[PDB]
Ligand binder design. Structure first.
Ligand SMILES: *[C@@H]1O[C@H](CO)[C@@H](O[C@@H]2O[C@H](CO)[C@@H](O[C@@H]3O[C@H](CO[C@H]4O[C@H](CO)[C@@H](O)[C@H](O)[C@@H]4O)[C@@H](O)[C@H](O[C@H]4O[C@H](CO)[C@@H](O)[C@H](O)[C@@H]4O[C@H]4O[C@H](CO)[C@@H](O)[C@H](O)[C@@H]4O)[C@@H]3O)[C@H](O)[C@H]2NC(C)=O)[C@H](O)[C@H]1NC(C)=O
Ligand SMILES: *[C@@H]1O[C@H](CO)[C@@H](O[C@@H]2O[C@H](CO)[C@@H](O[C@@H]3O[C@H](CO[C@H]4O[C@H](CO)[C@@H](O)[C@H](O)[C@@H]4O)[C@@H](O)[C@H](O[C@H]4O[C@H](CO)[C@@H](O)[C@H](O)[C@@H]4O)[C@@H]3O)[C@H](O)[C@H]2NC(C)=O)[C@H](O)[C@H]1NC(C)=O
Lengths: 52, 139
């Protein structure tokens, strides 16, 4: 009660910190995952067949 | 068609040279073969040197005395004979053909590269043949 405080959504550091967080978790979840380098091979592709 | 060097006569002991030429440079992707035809004895396969320049196979029975060269700049096949015995008195034909470079056992790596591959190539056919050069050896 009786409390008035300034706010600044744009100078807020919480958003920056949590963006850095989300980036960190996203990378960390990918570290123990299967590497997919052997996929970069020539692909013999044809068009695909009951398609609108 | 193909062109071969004219008929030759040689005293036994020395060497002889045979040239097979294509018209211009229209036959470069096809591989090169040399064959021999002893009358009444069928035909023999002298050897071949492929077209990319990675093979030089010559049958061991004729390995010592026979050499096969290819001049890229002039697009000319060279056949050199050294012993020139009585058995070499026959007709030599230059042939242009195609092979099948199949890929046999190959060691891919963990990342998916190609460490090495024997990729032995198989003879398919000899479409184009020279007019034939007669080499006569007389004592
Ligand atoms: C996954 O991995 C497989 C591995 O087997 C691979 O299949 C093979 O690919 C190679 C690469 O092209 C093929 O090699 C060619 O084969 C043809 C013959 O193919 C016919 O016959 C086979 C059965 O033997 C059939 O299965 C096939 O469907 C065809 O009907 C050869 O004729 C080719 O030779 C040419 O290339 C050589 C160099 O590669 C030359 O030395 C040779 O002289 C030939 O020259 C050609 O090109 C010249 C210009 O460069 C031209 O002037 C000539 O006139 C001529 O046209 C070649 O060896 C092989 O057949 C495939 N199959 C097998 C069982 O090995 C797959 O492709 C691969 N998948 C990918 C990469 O997506
Ligand atoms: C990267 O990949 C490319 C192609 O994918 C390679 O290029 C070829 O490499 C091969 C080697 O595996 C080369 O083949 C060799 O060429 C030699 C050239 O010799 C010249 O001189 C002799 C006279 O001394 C001539 O008779 C000949 O026609 C040439 O004009 C040959 O001497 C070699 O012959 C030897 O091996 C063959 C079998 O391989 C035997 O039958 C022979 O008796 C002899 O012992 C051989 O043929 C080829 O020339 C290369 N071509 C090109 C266009 O470069 C690269 O080498 C490769 N590089 C790496 C680092 O991997």
């Amino acid at each position: 009660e009786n409390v008035t405080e300034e706010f600044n959504m744009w100078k807020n550091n919480m958003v920056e910190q949590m963006h850095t967080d989300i980036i960190s978790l996203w990378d960390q979840s990918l570290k123990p995952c299967v590497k997919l380098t052997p996929l970069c091979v020539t692909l013999q592709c044809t068009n695909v067949n009951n398609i609108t | 068609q193909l062109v071969q060097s004219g008929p030759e006569v040689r005293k036994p002991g020395t060497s002889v040279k045979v040239s097979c030429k294509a018209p211009g440079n229209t036959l470069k992707t096809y591989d090169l073969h040399w064959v021999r035809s002893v009358p009444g004895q069928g035909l023999q396969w002298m050897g071949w040197i492929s077209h990319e320049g990675d093979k030089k196979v010559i049958v061991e029975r004729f390995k010592a005395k026979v050499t096969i060269d290819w001049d890229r700049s002039t697009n000319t096949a060279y056949l050199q004979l050294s012993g020139l015995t009585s058995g070499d008195t026959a007709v030599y034909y230059c042939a242009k053909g195609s092979k099948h470079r199949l890929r046999d056992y190959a060691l891919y790596d963990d990342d998916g590269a190609l460490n090495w591959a024997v990729d032995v190539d198989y003879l398919s056919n000899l479409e184009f043949w020279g007019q034939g050069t007669a080499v006569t050896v007389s004592s």
